Amino acid sequence: DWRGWNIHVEDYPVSHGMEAFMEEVTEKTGGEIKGKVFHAGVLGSQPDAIEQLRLGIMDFGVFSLGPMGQAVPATNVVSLPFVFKSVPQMYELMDGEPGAALGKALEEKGIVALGYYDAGARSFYNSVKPINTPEDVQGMKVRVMNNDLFVGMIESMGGNATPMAFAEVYQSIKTGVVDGAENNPPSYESTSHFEVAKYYSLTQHLIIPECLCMSKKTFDGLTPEQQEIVKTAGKNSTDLQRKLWGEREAASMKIIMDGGVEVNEIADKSAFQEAMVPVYEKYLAANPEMTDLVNLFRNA
Numbered sequence: 001d002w003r004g005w006n007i008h009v010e011d012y013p014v015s016h017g018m019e020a021f022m023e024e025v026t027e028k029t030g031g032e033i034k035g036k037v038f039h040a041g042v043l044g045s046q047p048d049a050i051e052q053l054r055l056g057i058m059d060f061g062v063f064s065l066g067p068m069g070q071a072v073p074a075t076n077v078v079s080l081p082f083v084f085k086s087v088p089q090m091y092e093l094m095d096g097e098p099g100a101a102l103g104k105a106l107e108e109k110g111i112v113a114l115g116y117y118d119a120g121a122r123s124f125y126n127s128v129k130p131i132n133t134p135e136d137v138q139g140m141k142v143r144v145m146n147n148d149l150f151v152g153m154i155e156s157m158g159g160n161a162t163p164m165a166f167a168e169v170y171q172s173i174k175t176g177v178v179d180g181a182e183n184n185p186p187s188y189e190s191t192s193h194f195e196v197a198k199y200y201s202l203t204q205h206l207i208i209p210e211c212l213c214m215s216k217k218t219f220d221g222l223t224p225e226q227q228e229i230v231k232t233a234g235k236n237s238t239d240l241q242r243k244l245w246g247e248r249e250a251a252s253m254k255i256i257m258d259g260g261v262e263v264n265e266i267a268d269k270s271a272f273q274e275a276m277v278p279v280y281e282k283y284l285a286a287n288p289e290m291t292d293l294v295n296l297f298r299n300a
Protein backbone atom coordinates (compact mmCIF):
# COMPACT_ATOMS: atom_id res chain seq x y z
CA ASP A 1 0.00 0.00 0.00
CA TRP A 2 1.31 3.46 -0.87
CA ARG A 3 1.94 6.22 1.62
CA GLY A 4 1.48 9.84 0.60
CA TRP A 5 2.73 12.93 2.41
CA ASN A 6 0.80 16.16 2.92
CA ILE A 7 1.76 19.01 5.24
CA HIS A 8 -1.75 20.50 5.29
CA VAL A 9 -4.91 20.03 7.29
CA GLU A 10 -7.39 17.52 5.85
CA ASP A 11 -9.78 20.20 4.60
CA TYR A 12 -7.44 22.01 2.18
CA PRO A 13 -7.17 22.03 -1.66
CA VAL A 14 -3.90 20.10 -1.77
CA SER A 15 -5.42 17.44 0.47
CA HIS A 16 -8.47 17.00 -1.74
CA GLY A 17 -6.27 16.89 -4.80
CA MET A 18 -4.12 14.13 -3.32
CA GLU A 19 -7.08 12.10 -2.17
CA ALA A 20 -8.62 12.39 -5.65
CA PHE A 21 -5.34 11.19 -7.14
CA MET A 22 -5.16 8.14 -4.88
CA GLU A 23 -8.85 7.34 -5.41
CA GLU A 24 -8.43 7.43 -9.17
CA VAL A 25 -5.36 5.20 -9.15
CA THR A 26 -7.19 2.63 -7.00
CA GLU A 27 -10.30 2.78 -9.17
CA LYS A 28 -8.45 2.44 -12.49
CA THR A 29 -6.19 -0.39 -11.26
CA GLY A 30 -9.22 -2.27 -9.94
CA GLY A 31 -7.82 -2.13 -6.42
CA GLU A 32 -4.39 -3.45 -7.40
CA ILE A 33 -2.84 -0.27 -6.03
CA LYS A 34 -4.15 1.15 -2.79
CA GLY A 35 -2.78 3.84 -0.54
CA LYS A 36 -3.41 6.55 1.95
CA VAL A 37 -2.64 10.23 2.24
CA PHE A 38 -1.27 11.22 5.64
CA HIS A 39 -2.23 14.78 6.41
CA ALA A 40 -0.90 17.46 8.75
CA GLY A 41 2.76 16.56 8.27
CA VAL A 42 2.43 13.53 10.56
CA LEU A 43 5.05 11.62 8.53
CA GLY A 44 7.65 14.37 8.77
CA SER A 45 8.74 17.94 8.21
CA GLN A 46 8.96 18.91 4.60
CA PRO A 47 12.75 18.64 4.07
CA ASP A 48 12.70 15.20 5.74
CA ALA A 49 9.68 14.08 3.68
CA ILE A 50 11.46 15.02 0.47
CA GLU A 51 14.41 12.89 1.59
CA GLN A 52 12.07 9.98 2.37
CA LEU A 53 10.52 10.23 -1.08
CA ARG A 54 13.89 10.23 -2.84
CA LEU A 55 14.85 7.14 -0.84
CA GLY A 56 11.60 5.33 -1.68
CA ILE A 57 10.40 5.35 1.92
CA MET A 58 7.52 7.64 0.96
CA ASP A 59 5.70 6.82 -2.29
CA PHE A 60 4.08 10.12 -3.18
CA GLY A 61 3.56 13.63 -1.90
CA VAL A 62 2.80 17.21 -2.68
CA PHE A 63 5.83 19.32 -1.89
CA SER A 64 6.43 23.02 -2.13
CA LEU A 65 9.39 23.65 -4.38
CA GLY A 66 10.62 26.07 -1.69
CA PRO A 67 12.32 23.48 0.54
CA MET A 68 13.17 21.37 -2.51
CA GLY A 69 16.06 23.73 -3.31
CA GLN A 70 18.43 21.73 -1.07
CA ALA A 71 17.85 18.32 -2.68
CA VAL A 72 17.35 19.68 -6.18
CA PRO A 73 19.38 22.84 -6.80
CA ALA A 74 17.63 23.72 -10.10
CA THR A 75 14.40 24.33 -8.22
CA ASN A 76 15.86 27.33 -6.36
CA VAL A 77 14.88 29.47 -9.35
CA VAL A 78 11.16 29.45 -8.40
CA SER A 79 12.00 30.67 -4.89
CA LEU A 80 13.46 33.93 -6.16
CA PRO A 81 11.31 36.87 -5.09
CA PHE A 82 9.04 38.29 -7.79
CA VAL A 83 10.46 35.86 -10.36
CA PHE A 84 6.93 35.17 -11.68
CA LYS A 85 4.84 38.13 -12.85
CA SER A 86 1.60 36.48 -11.76
CA VAL A 87 0.08 33.12 -10.91
CA PRO A 88 -1.33 32.60 -14.39
CA GLN A 89 2.17 33.19 -15.79
CA MET A 90 3.46 30.59 -13.31
CA TYR A 91 0.95 28.07 -14.73
CA GLU A 92 2.07 28.82 -18.28
CA LEU A 93 5.77 28.41 -17.44
CA MET A 94 5.42 25.39 -15.17
CA ASP A 95 3.14 23.58 -17.68
CA GLY A 96 5.57 24.42 -20.49
CA GLU A 97 9.27 24.08 -21.21
CA PRO A 98 10.58 25.73 -18.06
CA GLY A 99 8.50 23.37 -15.92
CA ALA A 100 9.75 20.46 -18.03
CA ALA A 101 13.37 21.44 -17.26
CA LEU A 102 12.57 21.40 -13.56
CA GLY A 103 10.84 18.05 -14.03
CA LYS A 104 14.06 16.64 -15.54
CA ALA A 105 16.10 18.02 -12.63
CA LEU A 106 13.72 16.36 -10.16
CA GLU A 107 13.97 13.04 -12.01
CA GLU A 108 17.77 13.18 -11.69
CA LYS A 109 17.31 13.31 -7.94
CA GLY A 110 14.81 10.43 -7.74
CA ILE A 111 11.54 12.34 -7.98
CA VAL A 112 8.88 11.96 -10.69
CA ALA A 113 6.78 15.11 -11.17
CA LEU A 114 3.11 14.44 -11.98
CA GLY A 115 1.75 17.96 -11.87
CA TYR A 116 2.20 21.43 -10.43
CA TYR A 117 -0.31 22.47 -7.78
CA ASP A 118 -1.17 26.11 -7.07
CA ALA A 119 -0.07 27.77 -3.84
CA GLY A 120 -0.92 31.31 -4.84
CA ALA A 121 1.40 34.09 -3.68
CA ARG A 122 3.00 34.52 -0.26
CA SER A 123 2.57 37.71 1.77
CA PHE A 124 3.80 38.88 5.17
CA TYR A 125 1.81 38.58 8.35
CA ASN A 126 2.85 39.71 11.79
CA SER A 127 1.67 40.69 15.27
CA VAL A 128 3.41 44.07 15.42
CA LYS A 129 2.31 46.46 12.65
CA PRO A 130 1.37 46.77 9.02
CA ILE A 131 4.08 46.41 6.43
CA ASN A 132 3.86 49.01 3.65
CA THR A 133 7.52 49.42 2.69
CA PRO A 134 10.61 47.24 3.08
CA GLU A 135 11.80 49.53 5.87
CA ASP A 136 8.87 48.26 7.97
CA VAL A 137 10.55 44.84 8.16
CA GLN A 138 13.65 46.25 9.88
CA GLY A 139 14.26 44.52 13.20
CA MET A 140 11.35 42.12 12.72
CA LYS A 141 11.79 38.47 13.64
CA VAL A 142 10.36 36.56 10.68
CA ARG A 143 10.08 32.80 10.28
CA VAL A 144 11.04 31.46 6.87
CA MET A 145 11.00 28.04 5.20
CA ASN A 146 14.15 25.94 4.92
CA ASN A 147 15.86 27.58 1.96
CA ASP A 148 18.84 29.96 2.36
CA LEU A 149 17.33 32.21 -0.32
CA PHE A 150 14.59 33.17 2.16
CA VAL A 151 17.09 34.12 4.84
CA GLY A 152 18.69 36.46 2.29
CA MET A 153 15.29 37.91 1.40
CA ILE A 154 14.50 38.88 4.99
CA GLU A 155 18.04 40.15 5.69
CA SER A 156 17.94 42.34 2.58
CA MET A 157 15.10 44.23 4.27
CA GLY A 158 16.85 44.35 7.62
CA GLY A 159 14.79 41.62 9.26
CA ASN A 160 16.01 38.69 11.30
CA ALA A 161 15.19 35.35 9.70
CA THR A 162 14.68 32.04 11.45
CA PRO A 163 14.25 28.87 9.33
CA MET A 164 11.59 26.78 11.08
CA ALA A 165 9.35 23.85 10.18
CA PHE A 166 5.80 24.89 9.25
CA ALA A 167 4.15 22.96 12.10
CA GLU A 168 6.07 24.96 14.75
CA VAL A 169 5.12 28.41 13.47
CA TYR A 170 1.79 28.82 15.29
CA GLN A 171 3.27 28.36 18.74
CA SER A 172 6.21 30.61 17.95
CA ILE A 173 3.96 33.44 16.82
CA LYS A 174 1.47 32.84 19.67
CA THR A 175 4.14 32.97 22.37
CA GLY A 176 5.72 36.04 20.82
CA VAL A 177 9.12 34.66 19.97
CA VAL A 178 8.74 35.36 16.26
CA ASP A 179 6.86 38.45 15.13
CA GLY A 180 5.51 36.86 11.97
CA ALA A 181 5.98 34.86 8.84
CA GLU A 182 4.79 34.87 5.22
CA ASN A 183 2.35 32.71 3.29
CA ASN A 184 -0.68 32.53 1.04
CA PRO A 185 -4.12 33.19 2.46
CA PRO A 186 -5.26 29.57 2.86
CA SER A 187 -2.08 28.67 4.78
CA TYR A 188 -2.33 31.77 6.99
CA GLU A 189 -5.97 30.94 7.71
CA SER A 190 -6.01 27.12 7.96
CA THR A 191 -3.16 27.07 10.49
CA SER A 192 -4.80 29.71 12.67
CA HIS A 193 -1.76 31.96 12.21
CA PHE A 194 -4.27 34.73 11.51
CA GLU A 195 -5.54 34.46 15.07
CA VAL A 196 -2.11 35.33 16.50
CA ALA A 197 -0.68 37.64 13.78
CA LYS A 198 -3.40 40.14 12.93
CA TYR A 199 -1.62 42.25 10.28
CA TYR A 200 -1.54 40.80 6.75
CA SER A 201 0.32 42.87 4.18
CA LEU A 202 -0.15 41.74 0.58
CA THR A 203 3.43 41.94 -0.69
CA GLN A 204 2.89 38.84 -2.83
CA HIS A 205 6.66 38.55 -2.91
CA LEU A 206 6.94 34.83 -3.74
CA ILE A 207 4.92 32.52 -5.98
CA ILE A 208 6.12 29.01 -5.25
CA PRO A 209 4.67 26.10 -7.21
CA GLU A 210 4.09 22.76 -5.54
CA CYS A 211 4.70 19.41 -7.11
CA LEU A 212 2.55 16.32 -6.88
CA CYS A 213 5.22 13.71 -7.25
CA MET A 214 6.16 10.13 -6.82
CA SER A 215 9.27 8.42 -5.67
CA LYS A 216 11.09 7.36 -8.82
CA LYS A 217 11.86 4.04 -7.12
CA THR A 218 8.14 3.42 -6.64
CA PHE A 219 7.24 4.69 -10.10
CA ASP A 220 9.89 2.57 -11.84
CA GLY A 221 8.44 -0.55 -10.19
CA LEU A 222 5.01 -0.02 -11.76
CA THR A 223 3.74 -1.74 -14.88
CA PRO A 224 3.56 0.43 -18.01
CA GLU A 225 -0.25 0.50 -17.74
CA GLN A 226 0.05 1.55 -14.11
CA GLN A 227 2.49 4.33 -15.01
CA GLU A 228 0.01 5.71 -17.54
CA ILE A 229 -2.81 5.51 -15.00
CA VAL A 230 -0.66 7.40 -12.49
CA LYS A 231 0.26 10.14 -14.95
CA THR A 232 -3.39 10.60 -16.00
CA ALA A 233 -4.60 10.64 -12.41
CA GLY A 234 -1.88 13.15 -11.55
CA LYS A 235 -2.99 15.49 -14.32
CA ASN A 236 -6.66 15.19 -13.38
CA SER A 237 -5.85 15.86 -9.71
CA THR A 238 -3.85 18.96 -10.66
CA ASP A 239 -6.80 20.31 -12.63
CA LEU A 240 -9.01 19.66 -9.60
CA GLN A 241 -6.61 21.19 -7.09
CA ARG A 242 -6.21 24.35 -9.14
CA LYS A 243 -9.98 24.77 -9.33
CA LEU A 244 -10.32 24.22 -5.58
CA TRP A 245 -7.45 26.63 -4.92
CA GLY A 246 -9.22 29.61 -6.52
CA GLU A 247 -12.33 29.01 -4.44
CA ARG A 248 -10.35 28.52 -1.22
CA GLU A 249 -8.15 31.59 -1.66
CA ALA A 250 -11.24 33.82 -1.63
CA ALA A 251 -12.93 31.84 1.16
CA SER A 252 -9.84 32.13 3.35
CA MET A 253 -9.57 35.89 2.65
CA LYS A 254 -13.18 36.23 3.78
CA ILE A 255 -12.46 34.31 7.01
CA ILE A 256 -9.36 36.44 7.64
CA MET A 257 -11.24 39.69 7.17
CA ASP A 258 -14.26 38.52 9.20
CA GLY A 259 -11.81 37.50 11.95
CA GLY A 260 -10.59 41.06 12.44
CA VAL A 261 -7.28 40.92 10.61
CA GLU A 262 -6.08 44.26 9.32
CA VAL A 263 -5.31 43.64 5.66
CA ASN A 264 -3.30 46.17 3.67
CA GLU A 265 -2.38 46.23 0.00
CA ILE A 266 0.95 47.44 -1.32
CA ALA A 267 0.84 50.61 -3.36
CA ASP A 268 4.61 50.91 -3.91
CA LYS A 269 5.50 47.41 -5.19
CA SER A 270 8.66 48.73 -6.87
CA ALA A 271 10.35 49.31 -3.52
CA PHE A 272 10.01 45.66 -2.51
CA GLN A 273 11.23 44.53 -5.90
CA GLU A 274 14.27 46.81 -5.69
CA ALA A 275 15.00 45.60 -2.17
CA MET A 276 15.31 42.05 -3.57
CA VAL A 277 17.98 42.72 -6.17
CA PRO A 278 20.69 41.40 -3.80
CA VAL A 279 18.99 38.00 -3.48
CA TYR A 280 19.34 37.53 -7.25
CA GLU A 281 22.90 38.83 -7.26
CA LYS A 282 23.85 36.44 -4.46
CA TYR A 283 22.17 33.40 -5.91
CA LEU A 284 23.81 33.84 -9.29
CA ALA A 285 27.20 34.63 -7.76
CA ALA A 286 27.16 31.34 -5.80
CA ASN A 287 25.60 29.43 -8.73
CA PRO A 288 26.69 30.93 -12.11
CA GLU A 289 25.67 27.79 -13.98
CA MET A 290 22.02 28.54 -13.16
CA THR A 291 22.03 31.87 -14.99
CA ASP A 292 20.40 30.54 -18.16
CA LEU A 293 17.61 28.82 -16.22
CA VAL A 294 16.91 31.89 -14.08
CA ASN A 295 16.54 34.02 -17.22
CA LEU A 296 14.20 31.43 -18.70
CA PHE A 297 11.87 32.40 -15.83
CA ARG A 298 12.50 36.04 -14.94
CA ASN A 299 12.61 37.23 -18.57
CA ALA A 300 9.54 35.31 -19.74
Ligand SMILES: O=C(O)[C@H]1O[C@@H](O)[C@H](O)[C@@H](O)[C@H]1O
Nearest residue numbers: 007064119145166183184187
Ligand atom coordinates in the same frame (compact mmCIF):
# COMPACT_ATOMS: atom_id res chain seq x y z
O1 LIG B 1 5.56 27.90 4.73
C1 LIG B 1 5.57 26.64 4.64
O2 LIG B 1 6.39 25.88 5.22
C2 LIG B 1 4.39 26.02 3.91
O3 LIG B 1 3.84 27.00 3.00
C3 LIG B 1 2.73 26.55 2.30
O4 LIG B 1 2.29 27.65 1.44
C4 LIG B 1 3.08 25.36 1.46
O5 LIG B 1 1.87 24.90 0.81
C5 LIG B 1 3.60 24.28 2.40
O6 LIG B 1 4.02 23.18 1.56
C6 LIG B 1 4.82 24.76 3.17
O7 LIG B 1 5.85 25.07 2.21
Ligand SMILES: [Cl-]
Nearest residue numbers: 045046165166
Ligand atom coordinates in the same frame (compact mmCIF):
# COMPACT_ATOMS: atom_id res chain seq x y z
CL1 LIG C 1 8.16 21.85 7.33
